[PDB]
Design an enzyme around this catalytic site. Structure first.
Site, mmCIF file in Angstrom:
data_model
loop_
_atom_site.group_PDB
_atom_site.id
_atom_site.type_symbol
_atom_site.label_atom_id
_atom_site.label_comp_id
_atom_site.label_asym_id
_atom_site.label_seq_id
_atom_site.Cartn_x
_atom_site.Cartn_y
_atom_site.Cartn_z
ATOM 1 N N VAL A 129 67.205 66.953 55.123
ATOM 2 C CA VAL A 129 68.633 66.642 54.973
ATOM 3 C C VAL A 129 69.070 65.522 55.936
ATOM 4 O O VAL A 129 69.795 64.592 55.549
ATOM 5 C CB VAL A 129 69.506 67.907 55.150
ATOM 6 C CG1 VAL A 129 70.988 67.565 55.097
ATOM 7 C CG2 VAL A 129 69.171 68.915 54.091
ATOM 8 N N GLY A 130 68.616 65.611 57.182
ATOM 9 C CA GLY A 130 68.822 64.542 58.159
ATOM 10 C C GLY A 130 67.817 64.642 59.288
ATOM 11 O O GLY A 130 66.789 65.319 59.151
ATOM 12 N N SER A 131 68.114 63.957 60.398
ATOM 13 C CA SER A 131 67.283 63.984 61.613
ATOM 14 C C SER A 131 67.988 64.733 62.759
ATOM 15 O O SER A 131 69.193 64.558 62.976
ATOM 16 C CB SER A 131 66.940 62.559 62.064
ATOM 17 O OG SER A 131 66.384 61.789 61.007
ATOM 18 N N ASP A 158 82.556 80.026 65.464
ATOM 19 C CA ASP A 158 82.344 78.569 65.493
ATOM 20 C C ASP A 158 82.509 77.961 64.107
ATOM 21 O O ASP A 158 81.698 77.143 63.671
ATOM 22 C CB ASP A 158 80.974 78.222 66.094
ATOM 23 C CG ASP A 158 80.907 76.797 66.612
ATOM 24 O OD1 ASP A 158 81.960 76.224 66.946
ATOM 25 O OD2 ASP A 158 79.797 76.241 66.686
ATOM 26 N N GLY A 182 67.362 68.747 61.033
ATOM 27 C CA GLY A 182 65.905 68.640 60.894
ATOM 28 C C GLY A 182 65.200 69.937 60.520
ATOM 29 O O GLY A 182 63.983 69.950 60.316
ATOM 30 N N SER A 183 65.956 71.029 60.439
ATOM 31 C CA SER A 183 65.398 72.327 60.085
ATOM 32 C C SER A 183 65.656 72.693 58.611
ATOM 33 O O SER A 183 65.230 73.745 58.149
ATOM 34 C CB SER A 183 65.961 73.411 61.011
ATOM 35 O OG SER A 183 67.338 73.651 60.743
HETATM 36 C C1 LIG Z 1 74.195 71.274 61.988
HETATM 37 C C2 LIG Z 1 74.330 72.748 61.669
HETATM 38 C C3 LIG Z 1 75.768 73.169 61.891
HETATM 39 N N1 LIG Z 1 73.903 73.057 60.261
HETATM 40 C C4 LIG Z 1 74.831 72.604 59.188
HETATM 41 C C5 LIG Z 1 74.483 73.369 57.932
HETATM 42 C C6 LIG Z 1 73.071 73.039 57.498
HETATM 43 C C7 LIG Z 1 72.834 73.765 56.209
HETATM 44 C C8 LIG Z 1 72.302 75.040 56.181
HETATM 45 C C9 LIG Z 1 72.078 75.710 54.998
HETATM 46 C C10 LIG Z 1 71.488 77.037 55.028
HETATM 47 C C11 LIG Z 1 72.245 78.097 55.482
HETATM 48 C C12 LIG Z 1 71.719 79.371 55.512
HETATM 49 C C13 LIG Z 1 70.427 79.591 55.096
HETATM 50 F F1 LIG Z 1 69.908 80.822 55.120
HETATM 51 C C14 LIG Z 1 69.653 78.557 54.640
HETATM 52 C C15 LIG Z 1 70.190 77.292 54.612
HETATM 53 CL CL1 LIG Z 1 69.136 76.056 54.019
HETATM 54 C C16 LIG Z 1 72.410 75.073 53.817
HETATM 55 C C17 LIG Z 1 72.932 73.792 53.820
HETATM 56 C C18 LIG Z 1 73.142 73.143 55.017
HETATM 57 N N2 LIG Z 1 73.255 73.156 52.594
HETATM 58 C C19 LIG Z 1 73.400 71.746 52.606
HETATM 59 C C20 LIG Z 1 74.649 71.195 52.762
HETATM 60 CL CL2 LIG Z 1 75.961 72.268 52.944
HETATM 61 C C21 LIG Z 1 74.853 69.832 52.777
HETATM 62 C C22 LIG Z 1 73.772 68.992 52.625
HETATM 63 C C23 LIG Z 1 72.513 69.530 52.462
HETATM 64 C C24 LIG Z 1 72.324 70.896 52.452
HETATM 65 CL CL3 LIG Z 1 70.739 71.539 52.246
HETATM 66 C C25 LIG Z 1 72.998 73.729 51.366
HETATM 67 O O1 LIG Z 1 73.243 73.157 50.318
HETATM 68 N N3 LIG Z 1 72.446 74.981 51.365
HETATM 69 C C26 LIG Z 1 72.194 75.780 52.524
HETATM 70 C C27 LIG Z 1 72.095 73.405 58.605
HETATM 71 C C28 LIG Z 1 72.464 72.786 59.947
#
Ligand SMILES: CC(C)N1CCC(c2cc(-c3ccc(F)cc3Cl)c3c(c2)N(c2c(Cl)cccc2Cl)C(=O)NC3)CC1
Ligand code: NA
Length: 335
Positions: free
Chosen positions: A28-30, A148, A34-35
């Site tokens: 998704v990004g860096s 948060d 990154g996870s």
């Molecule tokens: C920087 C921190 C605050 N954090 C922001 C949210 C990120 C994040 C986490 C999770 C997630 C949450 C719970 C879980 F069990 C498994 C997953 Cl993968 C998802 C997303 C994003 N998005 C997403 C969005 Cl919203 C926008 C773009 C790309 C993507 Cl992939 C989804 O579409 N699905 C799930 C992770 C990092």
């Protein structure tokens, strides 16, 4: 790639090991993103998001937090909360159990994206904020506090369906309740209502309400809108030590939110006025906010369910690192 039916690759300096069902992994990004990858799940036959947990069993608290995340994700199944479609580990035994992968709905965007790429109509803000509060009503009723909540933790797909991501598990401080800022030890669910207020303000105006450049500036910006608290309110929103940060500021009256939100639906202004309140327990609850005339297009009491209390008994007991691991391992294997 040791485990049968699994393959390895490097994505952002780190090795991802996923089953053959998961195809076309794209980061998704860096860094902080990154996870997380987008992927195609060939078993479920759909686009998905996949989260690799960083270091789940590094210490006691991380093992504990890993378990809790799994638990909350099952307990809080709801239309406006992210829910698990899959969970796995490349491990074949508890002896090599060091990584956990979480697979969810691919939403594709968060509220930041929504604010950045598009100006939002008032009707569109009603729908978005309705859903967020409806998700939060459920979360709170289970006895869980997010702590948060911000735009990057709120997922929205192209059909404007909204899901809350995470439950405060583990950054911008623009959305954090003052009582959290001031280290009040006894905060409750109302801290998330402050965050909703700031989020809603930002959807309406297309810009952040309180973008502090640092801790002191954050408090200053806040007081410059809501006004400085009485001593009696200050006594119930801060640690004794943090009082100085508000007392040494100049005394300021509350601003008229009609002058801050010039041109907005008077209902939005009213509601914002019941969310952005220093006296935390005077804040409107999520259940109460849903009944506000601002959401009168979408409010449906019969369809805004409450959760059973989240059961804390397992996490009330002290366990070794190796025990939280075994508990998590069985939790993963049971999916
Ligand atoms: C920087 C921190 C605050 N954090 C922001 C949210 C990120 C994040 C986490 C999770 C997630 C949450 C719970 C879980 F069990 C498994 C997953 Cl993968 C998802 C997303 C994003 N998005 C997403 C969005 Cl919203 C926008 C773009 C790309 C993507 Cl992939 C989804 O579409 N699905 C799930 C992770 C990092
Ligand atoms: Na429904």
């Amino acid at each position: 790639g040791p485990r049968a039916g699994f393959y390895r690759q490097e994505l952002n300096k780190t090795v991802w090991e996923v089953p053959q069902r998961l195809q076309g992994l794209r980061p998704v990004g860096s860094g902080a993103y990154g996870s997380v990858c987008s992927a195609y799940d060939a078993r479920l036959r759909q686009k998905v998001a996949v989260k690799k947990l960083s270091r789940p069993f590094q210490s006691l608290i991380h093992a504990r937090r890993t378990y809790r995340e799994l638990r909350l994700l099952k307990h809080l199944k709801h239309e406006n909360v992210i829910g698990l479609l899959d969970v796995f580990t490349p491990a074949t035994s508890i002896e090599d159990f060091s990584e956990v992968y979480l697979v969810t709905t691919l939403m594709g965007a968060d509220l930041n994206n929504i604010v950045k790429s598009q100006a939002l109509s008032d009707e569109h803000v009603q729908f978005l904020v309705y859903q967020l509060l409806r998700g939060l009503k459920y979360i709170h009723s289970a006895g869980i506090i997010h702590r948060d909540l911000k735009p990057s933790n709120v997922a929205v797909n192209e059909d404007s369906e909204l899901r809350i991501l995470d439950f405060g598990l583990a950054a911008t401080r623009w959305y954090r309740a003052p009582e959290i800022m001031l280290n009040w030890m006894h905060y409750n669910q109302t801290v998330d209502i402050w965050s909703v207020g700031c989020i809603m303000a930002e959807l309406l105006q297309g810009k952040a309400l309180f973008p502090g450049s640092d801790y002191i500036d954050q408090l200053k910006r806040i007081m410059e809108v809501v006004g400085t608290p009485s001593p009696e309110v200050l006594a119930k929103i801060s640690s004794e030590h943090a009082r100085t940060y508000i007392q040494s500021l100049p005394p300021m009256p509350q601003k008229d939110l009609s002058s801050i939100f010039r041109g907005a639906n008077p209902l939005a202004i009213d509601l914002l006025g019941r969310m952005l309140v220093l006296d935390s327990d005077q804040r409107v609850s999520a259940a109460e906010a849903l009944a506000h005339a601002y959401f009168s297009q979408y409010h449906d009491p019969e369809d805004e369910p409450e959760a059973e209390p989240y059961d804390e008994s397992v996490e009330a007991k002290e366990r070794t690192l190796e025990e939280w691991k075994e508990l998590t391992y069985q939790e993963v294997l049971s999916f």
